[PDB]
Structures are given as C-alpha cells and as structure tokens.
PDB file of C-alpha atoms in Angstrom:
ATOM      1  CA  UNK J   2      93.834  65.452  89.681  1.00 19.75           C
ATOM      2  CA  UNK J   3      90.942  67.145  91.674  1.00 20.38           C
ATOM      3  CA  UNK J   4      91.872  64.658  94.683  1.00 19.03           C
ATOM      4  CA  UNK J   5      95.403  65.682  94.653  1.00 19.33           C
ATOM      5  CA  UNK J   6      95.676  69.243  94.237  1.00 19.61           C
ATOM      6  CA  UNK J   7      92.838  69.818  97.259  1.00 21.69           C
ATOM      7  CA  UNK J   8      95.294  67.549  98.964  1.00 24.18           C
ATOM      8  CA  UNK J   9      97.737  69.284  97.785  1.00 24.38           C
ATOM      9  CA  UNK J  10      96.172  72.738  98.886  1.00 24.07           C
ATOM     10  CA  UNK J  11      95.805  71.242 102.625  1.00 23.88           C
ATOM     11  CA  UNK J  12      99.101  71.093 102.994  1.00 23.89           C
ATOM     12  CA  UNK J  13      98.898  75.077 103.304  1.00 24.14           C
ATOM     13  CA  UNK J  14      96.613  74.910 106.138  1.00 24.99           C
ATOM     14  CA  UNK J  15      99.057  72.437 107.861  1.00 26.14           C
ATOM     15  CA  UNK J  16     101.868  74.957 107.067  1.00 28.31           C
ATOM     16  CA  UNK J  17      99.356  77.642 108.693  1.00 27.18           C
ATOM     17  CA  UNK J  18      98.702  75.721 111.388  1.00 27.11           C
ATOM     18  CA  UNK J  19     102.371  76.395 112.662  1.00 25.20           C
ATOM     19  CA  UNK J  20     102.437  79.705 112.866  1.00 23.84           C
ATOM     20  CA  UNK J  21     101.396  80.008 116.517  1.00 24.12           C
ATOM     21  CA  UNK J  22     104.612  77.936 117.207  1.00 24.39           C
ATOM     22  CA  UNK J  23     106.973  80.414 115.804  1.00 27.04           C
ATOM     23  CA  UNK J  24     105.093  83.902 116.701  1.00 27.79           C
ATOM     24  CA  UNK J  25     106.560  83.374 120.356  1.00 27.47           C
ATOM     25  CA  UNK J  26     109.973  82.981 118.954  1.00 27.71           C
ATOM     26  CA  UNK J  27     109.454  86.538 117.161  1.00 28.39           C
ATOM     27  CA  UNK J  28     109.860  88.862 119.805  1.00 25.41           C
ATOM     28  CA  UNK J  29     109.169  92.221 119.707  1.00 26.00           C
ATOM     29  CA  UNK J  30     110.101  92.212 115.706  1.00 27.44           C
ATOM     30  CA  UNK J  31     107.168  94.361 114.177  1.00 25.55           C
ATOM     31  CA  UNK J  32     104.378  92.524 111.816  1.00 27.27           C
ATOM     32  CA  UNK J  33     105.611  94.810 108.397  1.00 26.62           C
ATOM     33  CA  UNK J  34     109.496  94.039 108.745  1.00 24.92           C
ATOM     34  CA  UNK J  35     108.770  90.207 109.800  1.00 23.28           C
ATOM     35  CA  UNK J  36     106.776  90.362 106.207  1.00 21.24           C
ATOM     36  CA  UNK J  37     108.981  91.797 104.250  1.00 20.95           C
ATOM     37  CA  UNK J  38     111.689  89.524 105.637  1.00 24.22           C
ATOM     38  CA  UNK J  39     109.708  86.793 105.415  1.00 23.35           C
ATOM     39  CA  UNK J  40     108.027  86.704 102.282  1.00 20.55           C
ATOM     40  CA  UNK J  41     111.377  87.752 100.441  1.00 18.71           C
ATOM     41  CA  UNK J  42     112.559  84.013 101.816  1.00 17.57           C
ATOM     42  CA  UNK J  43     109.268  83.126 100.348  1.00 15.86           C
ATOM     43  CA  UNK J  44     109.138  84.511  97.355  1.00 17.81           C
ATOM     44  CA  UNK J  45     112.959  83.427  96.662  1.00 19.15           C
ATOM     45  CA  UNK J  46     111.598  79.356  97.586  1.00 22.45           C
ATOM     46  CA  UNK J  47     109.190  79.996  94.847  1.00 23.71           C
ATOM     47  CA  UNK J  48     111.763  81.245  92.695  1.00 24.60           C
ATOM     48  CA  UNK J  49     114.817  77.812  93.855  1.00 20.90           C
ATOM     49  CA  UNK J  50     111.253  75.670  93.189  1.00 22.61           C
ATOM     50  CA  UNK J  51     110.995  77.099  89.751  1.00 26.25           C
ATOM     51  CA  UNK J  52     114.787  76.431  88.412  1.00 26.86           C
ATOM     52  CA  UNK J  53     115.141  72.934  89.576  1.00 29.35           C
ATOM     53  CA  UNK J  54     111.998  72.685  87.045  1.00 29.67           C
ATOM     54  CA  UNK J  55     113.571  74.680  85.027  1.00 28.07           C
ATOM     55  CA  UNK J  56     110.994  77.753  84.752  1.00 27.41           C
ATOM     56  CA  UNK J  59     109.143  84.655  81.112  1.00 25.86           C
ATOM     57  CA  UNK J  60     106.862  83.687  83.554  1.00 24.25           C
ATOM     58  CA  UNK J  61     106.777  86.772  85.829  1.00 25.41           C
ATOM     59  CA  UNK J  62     105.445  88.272  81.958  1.00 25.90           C
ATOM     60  CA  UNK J  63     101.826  88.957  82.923  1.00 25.51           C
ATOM     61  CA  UNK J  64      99.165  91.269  82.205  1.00 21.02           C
ATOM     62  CA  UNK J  65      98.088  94.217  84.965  1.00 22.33           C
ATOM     63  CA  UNK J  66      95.004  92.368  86.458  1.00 21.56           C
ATOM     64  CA  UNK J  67      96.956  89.256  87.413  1.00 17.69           C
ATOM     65  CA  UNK J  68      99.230  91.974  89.654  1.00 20.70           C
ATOM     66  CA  UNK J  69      96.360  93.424  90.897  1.00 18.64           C
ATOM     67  CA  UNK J  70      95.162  89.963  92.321  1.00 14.17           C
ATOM     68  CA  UNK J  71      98.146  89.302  93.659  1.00 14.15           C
ATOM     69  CA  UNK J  72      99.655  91.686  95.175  1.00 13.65           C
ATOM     70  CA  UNK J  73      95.982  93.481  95.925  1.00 11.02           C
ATOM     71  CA  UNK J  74      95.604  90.140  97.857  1.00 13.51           C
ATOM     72  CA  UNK J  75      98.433  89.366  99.453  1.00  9.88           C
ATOM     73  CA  UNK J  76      99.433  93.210 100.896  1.00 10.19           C
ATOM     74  CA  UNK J  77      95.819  93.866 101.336  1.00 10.18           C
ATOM     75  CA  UNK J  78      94.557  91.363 103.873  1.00  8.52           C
ATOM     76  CA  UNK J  79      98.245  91.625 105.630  1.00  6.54           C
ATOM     77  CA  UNK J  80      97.907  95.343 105.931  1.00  3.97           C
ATOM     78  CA  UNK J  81      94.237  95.345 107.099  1.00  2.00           C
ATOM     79  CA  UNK J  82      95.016  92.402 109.703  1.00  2.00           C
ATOM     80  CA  UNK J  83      98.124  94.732 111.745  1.00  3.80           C
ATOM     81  CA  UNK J  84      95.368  97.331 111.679  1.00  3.37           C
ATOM     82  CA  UNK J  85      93.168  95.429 112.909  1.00  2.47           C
ATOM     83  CA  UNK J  86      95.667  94.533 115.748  1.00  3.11           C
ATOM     84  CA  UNK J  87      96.442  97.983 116.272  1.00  3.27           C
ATOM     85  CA  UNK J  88      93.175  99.050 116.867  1.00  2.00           C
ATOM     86  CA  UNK J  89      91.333  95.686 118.887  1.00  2.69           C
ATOM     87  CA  UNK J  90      92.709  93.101 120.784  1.00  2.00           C
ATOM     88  CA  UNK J  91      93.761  90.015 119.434  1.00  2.00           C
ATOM     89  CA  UNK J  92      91.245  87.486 120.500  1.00  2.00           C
ATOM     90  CA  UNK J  93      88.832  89.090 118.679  1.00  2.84           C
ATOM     91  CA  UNK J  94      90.673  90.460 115.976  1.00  2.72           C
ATOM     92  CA  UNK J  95      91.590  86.416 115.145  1.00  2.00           C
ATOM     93  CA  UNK J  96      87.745  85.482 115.372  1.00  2.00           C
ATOM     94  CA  UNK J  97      86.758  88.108 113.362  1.00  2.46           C
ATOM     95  CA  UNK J  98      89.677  87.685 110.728  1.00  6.00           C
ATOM     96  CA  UNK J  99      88.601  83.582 110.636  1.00  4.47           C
ATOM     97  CA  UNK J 100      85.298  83.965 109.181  1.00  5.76           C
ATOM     98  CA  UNK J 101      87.731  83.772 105.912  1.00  5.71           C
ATOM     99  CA  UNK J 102      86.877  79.789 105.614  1.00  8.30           C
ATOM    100  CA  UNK J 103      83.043  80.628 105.352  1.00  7.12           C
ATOM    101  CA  UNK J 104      83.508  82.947 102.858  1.00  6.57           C
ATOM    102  CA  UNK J 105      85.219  80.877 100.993  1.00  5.87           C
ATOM    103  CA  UNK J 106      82.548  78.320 101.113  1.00  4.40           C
ATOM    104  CA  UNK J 107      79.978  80.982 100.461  1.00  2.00           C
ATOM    105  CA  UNK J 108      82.341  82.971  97.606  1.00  2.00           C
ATOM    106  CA  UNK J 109      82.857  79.432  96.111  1.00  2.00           C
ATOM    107  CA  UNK J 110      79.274  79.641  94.761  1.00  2.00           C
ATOM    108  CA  UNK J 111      80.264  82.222  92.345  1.00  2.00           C
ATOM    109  CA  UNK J 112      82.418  79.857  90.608  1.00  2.00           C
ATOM    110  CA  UNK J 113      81.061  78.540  87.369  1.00  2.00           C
ATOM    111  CA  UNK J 114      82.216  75.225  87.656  1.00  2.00           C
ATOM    112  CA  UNK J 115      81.408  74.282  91.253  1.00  2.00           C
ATOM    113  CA  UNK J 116      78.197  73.680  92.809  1.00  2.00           C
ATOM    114  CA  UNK J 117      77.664  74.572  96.809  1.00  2.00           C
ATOM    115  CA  UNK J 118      76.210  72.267  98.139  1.00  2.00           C
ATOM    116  CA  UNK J 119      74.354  72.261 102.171  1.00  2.00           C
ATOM    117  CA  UNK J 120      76.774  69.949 103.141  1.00  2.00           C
ATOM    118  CA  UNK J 121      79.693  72.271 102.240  1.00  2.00           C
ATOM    119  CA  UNK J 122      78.398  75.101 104.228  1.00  2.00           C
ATOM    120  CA  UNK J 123      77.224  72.995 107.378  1.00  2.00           C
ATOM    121  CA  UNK J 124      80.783  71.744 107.384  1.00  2.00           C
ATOM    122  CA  UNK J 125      82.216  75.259 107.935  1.00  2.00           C
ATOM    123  CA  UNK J 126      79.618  76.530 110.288  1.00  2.00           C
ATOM    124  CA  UNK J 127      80.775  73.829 112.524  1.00  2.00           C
ATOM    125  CA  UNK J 128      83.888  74.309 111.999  1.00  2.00           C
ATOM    126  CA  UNK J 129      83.141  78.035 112.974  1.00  2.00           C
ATOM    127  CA  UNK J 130      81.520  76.632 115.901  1.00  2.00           C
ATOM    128  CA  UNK J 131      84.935  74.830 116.864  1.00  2.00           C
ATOM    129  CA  UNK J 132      86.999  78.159 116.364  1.00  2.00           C
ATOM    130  CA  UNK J 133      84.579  80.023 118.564  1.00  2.00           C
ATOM    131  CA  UNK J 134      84.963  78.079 121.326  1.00  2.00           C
ATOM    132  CA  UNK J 135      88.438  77.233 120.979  1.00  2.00           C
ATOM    133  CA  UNK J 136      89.434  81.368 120.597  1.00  2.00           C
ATOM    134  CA  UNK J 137      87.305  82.007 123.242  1.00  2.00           C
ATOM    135  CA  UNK J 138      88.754  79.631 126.034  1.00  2.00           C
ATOM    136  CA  UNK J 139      91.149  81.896 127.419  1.00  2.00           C
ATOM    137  CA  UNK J 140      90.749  83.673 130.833  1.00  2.00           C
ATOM    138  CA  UNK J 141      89.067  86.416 129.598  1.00  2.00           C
ATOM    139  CA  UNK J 142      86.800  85.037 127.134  1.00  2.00           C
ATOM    140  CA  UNK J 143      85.306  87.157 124.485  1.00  2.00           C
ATOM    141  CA  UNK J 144      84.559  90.714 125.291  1.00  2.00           C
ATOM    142  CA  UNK J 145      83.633  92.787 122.066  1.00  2.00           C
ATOM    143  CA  UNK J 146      83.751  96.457 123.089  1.00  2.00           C
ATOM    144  CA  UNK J 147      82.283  99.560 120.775  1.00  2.00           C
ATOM    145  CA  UNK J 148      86.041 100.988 121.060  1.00  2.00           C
ATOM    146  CA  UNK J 149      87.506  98.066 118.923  1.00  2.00           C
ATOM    147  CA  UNK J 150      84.878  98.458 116.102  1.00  2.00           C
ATOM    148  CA  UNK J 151      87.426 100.125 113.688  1.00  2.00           C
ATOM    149  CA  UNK J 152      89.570  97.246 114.437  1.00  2.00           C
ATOM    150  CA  UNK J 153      86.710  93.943 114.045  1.00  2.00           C
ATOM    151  CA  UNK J 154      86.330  96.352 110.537  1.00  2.00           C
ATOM    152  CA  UNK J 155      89.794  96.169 109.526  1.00  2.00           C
ATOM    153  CA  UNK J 156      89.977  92.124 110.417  1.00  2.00           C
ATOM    154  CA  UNK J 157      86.526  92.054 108.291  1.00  2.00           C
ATOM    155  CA  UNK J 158      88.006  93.638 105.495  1.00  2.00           C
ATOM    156  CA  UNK J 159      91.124  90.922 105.866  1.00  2.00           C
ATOM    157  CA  UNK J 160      88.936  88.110 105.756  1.00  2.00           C
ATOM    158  CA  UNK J 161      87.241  89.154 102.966  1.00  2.00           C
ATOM    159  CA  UNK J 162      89.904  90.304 101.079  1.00  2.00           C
ATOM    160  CA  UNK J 163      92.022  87.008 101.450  1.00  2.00           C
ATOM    161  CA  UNK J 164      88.894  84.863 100.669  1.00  2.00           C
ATOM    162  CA  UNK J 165      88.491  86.835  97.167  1.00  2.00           C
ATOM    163  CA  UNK J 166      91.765  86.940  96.681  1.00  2.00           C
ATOM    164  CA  UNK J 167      91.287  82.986  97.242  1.00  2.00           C
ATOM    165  CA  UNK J 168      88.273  81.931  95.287  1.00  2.00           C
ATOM    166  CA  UNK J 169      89.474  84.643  92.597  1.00  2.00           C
ATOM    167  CA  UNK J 170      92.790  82.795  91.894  1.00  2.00           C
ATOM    168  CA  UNK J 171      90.780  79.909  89.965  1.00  2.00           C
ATOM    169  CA  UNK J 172      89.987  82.702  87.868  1.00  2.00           C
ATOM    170  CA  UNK J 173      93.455  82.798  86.632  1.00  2.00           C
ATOM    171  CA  UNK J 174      93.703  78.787  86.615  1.00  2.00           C
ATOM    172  CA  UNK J 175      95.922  79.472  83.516  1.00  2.00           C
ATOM    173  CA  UNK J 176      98.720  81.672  85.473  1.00  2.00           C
ATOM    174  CA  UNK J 177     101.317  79.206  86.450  1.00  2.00           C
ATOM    175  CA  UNK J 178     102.398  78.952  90.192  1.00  2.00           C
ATOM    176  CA  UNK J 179     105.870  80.189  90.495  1.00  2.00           C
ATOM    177  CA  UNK J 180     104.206  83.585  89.989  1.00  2.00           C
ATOM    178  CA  UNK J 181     102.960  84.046  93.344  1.00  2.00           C
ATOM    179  CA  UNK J 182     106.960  84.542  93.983  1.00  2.00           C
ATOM    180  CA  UNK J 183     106.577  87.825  92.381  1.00  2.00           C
ATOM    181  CA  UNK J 184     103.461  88.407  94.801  1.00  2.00           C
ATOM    182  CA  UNK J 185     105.622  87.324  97.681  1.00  2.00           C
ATOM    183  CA  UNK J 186     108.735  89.421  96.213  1.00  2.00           C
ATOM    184  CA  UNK J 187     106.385  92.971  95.645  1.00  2.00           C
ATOM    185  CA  UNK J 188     104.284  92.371  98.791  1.00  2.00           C
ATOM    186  CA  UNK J 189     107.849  92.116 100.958  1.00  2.00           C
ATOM    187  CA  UNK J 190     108.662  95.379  98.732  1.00  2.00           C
ATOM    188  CA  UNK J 191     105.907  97.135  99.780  1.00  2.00           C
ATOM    189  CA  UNK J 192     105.938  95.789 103.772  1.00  2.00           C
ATOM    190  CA  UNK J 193     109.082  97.299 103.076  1.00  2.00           C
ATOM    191  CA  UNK J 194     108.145 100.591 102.585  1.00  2.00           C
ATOM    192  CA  UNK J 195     105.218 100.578 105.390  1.00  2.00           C
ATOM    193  CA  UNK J 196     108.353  99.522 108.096  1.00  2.00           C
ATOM    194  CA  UNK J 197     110.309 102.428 107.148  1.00  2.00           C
ATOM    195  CA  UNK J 198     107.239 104.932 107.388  1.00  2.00           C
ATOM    196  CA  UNK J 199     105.092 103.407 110.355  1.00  2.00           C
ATOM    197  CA  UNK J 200     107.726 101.139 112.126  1.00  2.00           C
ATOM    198  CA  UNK J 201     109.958 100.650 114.964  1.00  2.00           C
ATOM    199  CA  UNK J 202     113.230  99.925 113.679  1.00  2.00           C
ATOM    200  CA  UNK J 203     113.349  96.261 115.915  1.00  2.00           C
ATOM    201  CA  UNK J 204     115.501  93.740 113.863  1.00  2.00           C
ATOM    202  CA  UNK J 205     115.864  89.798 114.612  1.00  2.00           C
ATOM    203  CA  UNK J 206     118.369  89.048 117.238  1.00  2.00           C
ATOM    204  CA  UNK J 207     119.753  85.759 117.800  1.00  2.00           C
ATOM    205  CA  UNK J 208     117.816  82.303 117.288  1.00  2.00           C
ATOM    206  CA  UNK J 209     114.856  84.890 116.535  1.00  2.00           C
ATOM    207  CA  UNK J 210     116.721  84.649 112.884  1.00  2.00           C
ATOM    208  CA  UNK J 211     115.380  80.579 112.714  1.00  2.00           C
ATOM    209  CA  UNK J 212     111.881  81.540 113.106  1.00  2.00           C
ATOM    210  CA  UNK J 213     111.962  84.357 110.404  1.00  2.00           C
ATOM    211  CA  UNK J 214     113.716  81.533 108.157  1.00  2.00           C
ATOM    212  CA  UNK J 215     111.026  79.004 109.139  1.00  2.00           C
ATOM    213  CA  UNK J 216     108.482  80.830 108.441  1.00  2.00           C
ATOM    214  CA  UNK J 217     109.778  82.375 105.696  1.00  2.00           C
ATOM    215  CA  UNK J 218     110.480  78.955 104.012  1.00  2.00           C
ATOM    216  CA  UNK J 219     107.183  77.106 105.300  1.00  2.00           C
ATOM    217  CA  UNK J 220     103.964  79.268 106.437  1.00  2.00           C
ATOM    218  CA  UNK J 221     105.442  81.582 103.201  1.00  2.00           C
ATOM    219  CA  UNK J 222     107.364  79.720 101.074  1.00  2.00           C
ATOM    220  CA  UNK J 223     105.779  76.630 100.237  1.00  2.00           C
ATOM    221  CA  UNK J 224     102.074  77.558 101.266  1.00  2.00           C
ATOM    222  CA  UNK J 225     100.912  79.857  99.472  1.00  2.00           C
ATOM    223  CA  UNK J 226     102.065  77.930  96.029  1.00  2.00           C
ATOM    224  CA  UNK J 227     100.500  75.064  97.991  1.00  2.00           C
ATOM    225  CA  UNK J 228      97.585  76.800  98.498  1.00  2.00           C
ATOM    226  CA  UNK J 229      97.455  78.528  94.638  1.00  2.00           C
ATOM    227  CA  UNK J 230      97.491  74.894  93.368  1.00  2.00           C
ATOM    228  CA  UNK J 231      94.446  74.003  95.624  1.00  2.00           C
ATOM    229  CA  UNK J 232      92.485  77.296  94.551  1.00  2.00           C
ATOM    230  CA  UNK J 233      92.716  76.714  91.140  1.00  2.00           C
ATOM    231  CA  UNK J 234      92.373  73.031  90.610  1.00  2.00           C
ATOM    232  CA  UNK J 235      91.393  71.344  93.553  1.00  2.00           C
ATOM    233  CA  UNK J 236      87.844  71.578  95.699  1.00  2.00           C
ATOM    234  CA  UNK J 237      87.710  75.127  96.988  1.00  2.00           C
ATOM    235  CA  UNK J 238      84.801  74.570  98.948  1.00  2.00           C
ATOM    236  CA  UNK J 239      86.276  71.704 100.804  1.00  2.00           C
ATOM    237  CA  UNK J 240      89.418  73.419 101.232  1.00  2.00           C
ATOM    238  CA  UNK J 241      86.944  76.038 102.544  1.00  2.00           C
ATOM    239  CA  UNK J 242      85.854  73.924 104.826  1.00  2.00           C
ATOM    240  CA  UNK J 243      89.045  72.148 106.059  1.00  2.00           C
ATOM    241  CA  UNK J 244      90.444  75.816 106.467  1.00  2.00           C
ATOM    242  CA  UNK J 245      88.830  75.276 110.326  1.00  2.00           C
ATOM    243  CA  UNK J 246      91.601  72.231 111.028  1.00  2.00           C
ATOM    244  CA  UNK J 247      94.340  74.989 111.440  1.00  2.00           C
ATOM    245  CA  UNK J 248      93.335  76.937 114.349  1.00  2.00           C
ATOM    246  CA  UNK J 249      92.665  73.518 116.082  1.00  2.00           C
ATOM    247  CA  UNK J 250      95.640  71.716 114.561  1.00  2.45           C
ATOM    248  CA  UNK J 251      97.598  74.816 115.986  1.00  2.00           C
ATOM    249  CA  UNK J 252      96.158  74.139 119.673  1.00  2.00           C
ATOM    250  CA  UNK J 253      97.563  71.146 119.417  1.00  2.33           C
ATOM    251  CA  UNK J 254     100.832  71.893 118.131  1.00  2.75           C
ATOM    252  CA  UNK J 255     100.772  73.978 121.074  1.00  3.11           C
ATOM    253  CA  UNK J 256      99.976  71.188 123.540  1.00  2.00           C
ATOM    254  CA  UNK J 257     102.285  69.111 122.324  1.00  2.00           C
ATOM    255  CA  UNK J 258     105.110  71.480 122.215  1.00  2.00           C
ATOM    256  CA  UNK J 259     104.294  72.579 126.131  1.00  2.00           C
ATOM    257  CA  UNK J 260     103.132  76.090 125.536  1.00  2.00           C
ATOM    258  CA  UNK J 261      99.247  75.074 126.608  1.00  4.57           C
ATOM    259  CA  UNK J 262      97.466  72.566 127.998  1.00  4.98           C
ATOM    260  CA  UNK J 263      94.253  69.815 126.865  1.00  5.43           C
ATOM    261  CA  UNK J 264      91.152  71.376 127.629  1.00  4.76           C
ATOM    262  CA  UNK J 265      87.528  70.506 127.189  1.00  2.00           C
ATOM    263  CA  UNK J 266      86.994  73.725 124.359  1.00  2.00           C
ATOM    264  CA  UNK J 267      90.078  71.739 122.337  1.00  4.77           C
ATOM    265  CA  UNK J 268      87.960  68.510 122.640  1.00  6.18           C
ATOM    266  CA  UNK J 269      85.116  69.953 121.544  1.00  9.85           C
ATOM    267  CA  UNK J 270      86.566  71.894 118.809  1.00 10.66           C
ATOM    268  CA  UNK J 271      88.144  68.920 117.417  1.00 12.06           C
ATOM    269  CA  UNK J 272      85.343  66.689 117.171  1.00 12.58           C
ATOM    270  CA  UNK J 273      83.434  70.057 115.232  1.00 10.65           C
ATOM    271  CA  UNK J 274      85.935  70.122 112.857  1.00 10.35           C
ATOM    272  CA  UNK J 275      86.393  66.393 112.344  1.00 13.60           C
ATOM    273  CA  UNK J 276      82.479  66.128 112.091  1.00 16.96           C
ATOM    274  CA  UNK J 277      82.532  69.399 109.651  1.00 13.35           C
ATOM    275  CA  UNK J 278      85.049  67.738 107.438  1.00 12.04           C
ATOM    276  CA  UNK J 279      83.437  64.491 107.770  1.00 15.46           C
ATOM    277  CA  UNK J 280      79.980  65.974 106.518  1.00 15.95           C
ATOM    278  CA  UNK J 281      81.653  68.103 103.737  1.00 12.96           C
ATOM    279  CA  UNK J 282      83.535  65.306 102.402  1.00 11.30           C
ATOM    280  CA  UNK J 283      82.194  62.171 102.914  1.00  9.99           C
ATOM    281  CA  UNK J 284      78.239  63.067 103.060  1.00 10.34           C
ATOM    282  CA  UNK J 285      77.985  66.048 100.718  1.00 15.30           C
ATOM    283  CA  UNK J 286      76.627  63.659  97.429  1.00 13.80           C
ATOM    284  CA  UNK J 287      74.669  61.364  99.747  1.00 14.46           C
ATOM    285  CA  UNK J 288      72.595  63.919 102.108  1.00 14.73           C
ATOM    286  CA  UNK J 289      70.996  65.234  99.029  1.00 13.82           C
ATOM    287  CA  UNK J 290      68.141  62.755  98.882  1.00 10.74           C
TER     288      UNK J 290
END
C-alpha cells in the first residue's frame, strides 16, 4: 500500500529526528569510527530483521553496489568534510536542501507526477529550517573561507537525494540488502578512521548512544526509509523530510537541552502548513 509504505518511510525521519539527542552523548568519538561502529549495529539489525523472516539475497549485480554503497559512504564522507572545512550551522543548512531535491529529483520518476503543491510544501518547509538553524546567537554568517566546505555539504545533499529518488529504481531489490550497504559502508569508515583519524574510542555510557543509534537512526531507518523510496510517495516524503529538524528542536526542549522560542513556533507552523498543502491540497489546488 502507497499509504503505508510513505508511512512507513516517515518513520525514518522520526528515527532522524533523534539524532541531535544522542550527538551530545558522543563525545569527542570521531564522525568515521562512530560510522563504522554504528552502521555495523545497523547493518547486523538488518541482517536479525531478515532471519526472523527467514531471508541469496546479498546476490546482486554491480550497479545495485554502486547505489548503495556510492550513496551511503558518499554523502557521509562529503558531510565530515564539509564539517572540517565550515562551521556547522551552515554546513547543516546547506546539507538540508536534500528534502527539495528530493521533491525536485522526484520529477524524474516515471511514475510520479510533481505537482506545485509538492514543491510549495518543501519550500516552506525550507523556510522553517532556515529560521530554526539560524536562531542561535550567532545567526548565519556565510564566509568565502568556508566555500570548500558549503561545496562538500552540497555535494552530500545531492548525493543522498539521488541516492534516494534512485532507490525506486531498484523497487525490485529487496530491503534486507541495505544491510550489506550498512555492513561495506562501516568497512570502508573503517578504513578512513585508521588513515585520517584520532584513535578516540567510546568510554562509558558513551557505548548506549553508539548502540542507540546504531539500532535506530541506522538500523531500522534506513530499511524504513528504502521501503518509503521505493513504494511509497517520494515527493511527500520529500516534503515531510522538513518535520525532522523541527521534531528534533523539540526533542530537545523537551529533554532540557534548549528552550521554546518564537523561530521553533514559527518553524512548526511552516512545516505543519507545508505538509498540510502537500498532502491534503495537492489534487484540489489544481483547478
């Protein structure tokens, strides 16, 4: 059902949404190892998901690795560059123009039809991101130095939001084979901590965020998120991709690490209005 998987394929961007929560509890692990830890968790939850069902899968021809693990080491390695080489504020902003693309990218696909609704829903919910990102102290200061970095969390965004709308390409590629993308990316993360990183390992309760996120953000949403790119409504899922950087303000709030502002007001009613547009006005504002 078209209903259920895009339902289905929200569920990622709720997972997503967490991720804020648990990058505090890190610590000064480095982005490769915390990858290659993590998404070994996550590609062994998509392995555990596959024998309970009782699933010669990982069998597959050369371009279905190339999507995969092209996707899922590319826009990882391009986003710690792009933290290496810009600060984060802006490195996030530039890195979450991935929803639009989608939205825009979506158009490509035979099936679908993009409608103005659709892309009005994730300009506002662009809308809500900028102002949300850009509420801290600071605000948003892009500076010529940082250029090679805004690149590097360009080339992220795109390459996560082809990697995205290309995965209803290979509809027919069941799910549990994103555990070998998991399983090769961590290999690979891997071999870029050796090479580039400073040997800082877990330490303590740091250990229950690298399993949480290993298990959730890792382990259940991207199969969460594969189901919702290849049978549910990508543009909408587009579109709701906005919820998570609100959703994880609030998380945030909630938990005690930040307080209600007027930017997380306003962002919330962009994003509920953007949904609201996309989903329940998209057939309807055609006439």
């Amino acid at each position: 059902s078209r209903s259920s998987a895009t339902l289905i394929g929200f569920t990622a961007i709720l997972l997503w949404s967490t991720l804020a929560l648990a990058t505090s509890s890190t610590g000064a692990v480095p982005p490769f190892l915390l990858t290659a830890l993590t998404f070994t968790i996550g590609g062994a939850v998509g392995i555990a998901a596959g024998l309970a069902r009782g699933v010669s899968v990982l069998r597959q021809p050369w371009p279905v690795w190339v999507h995969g693990i092209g996707g899922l080491f590319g826009y990882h390695f391009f986003y710690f560059s792009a933290l290496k080489l810009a600060p984060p504020a802006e490195a996030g902003l530039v890195a979450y123009l991935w929803p639009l693309l989608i939205v825009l990218f979506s158009a490509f696909l035979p099936g679908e039809r993009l409608r103005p609704a659709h892309v009005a829903g994730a300009l506002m919910g662009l809308a809500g991101t900028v102002v949300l990102l850009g509420a801290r102290a600071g605000g948003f200061g892009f500076a010529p130095e940082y250029v090679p970095g805004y690149l590097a969390a360009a080339a992220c965004a795109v390459i996560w939001s082809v990697y995205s709308v290309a995965s209803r390409r290979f509809a027919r590629v069941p799910t549990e084979v994103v555990a070998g993308f998991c399983l090769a990316t961590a290999a690979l993360s891997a071999l870029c901590h050796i090479l580039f990183e400073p040997s800082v390992w877990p330490v303590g309760s740091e250990w229950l965020a690298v399993v949480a996120l290993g298990i959730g953000p890792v382990g259940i949403a991207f199969y969460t998120w594969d189901i919702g790119m290849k049978r549910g409504d990508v543009r909408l899922l587009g579109v709701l991709s906005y919820a998570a950087p609100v959703l994880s303000t609030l998380l945030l709030v909630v938990a005690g690490f930040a307080a209600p502002s007027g930017a997380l007001a306003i962002a919330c009613a962009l994003i509920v209005g953007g949904a609201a547009v996309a989903t329940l006005l998209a057939r309807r504002l055609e006439s």
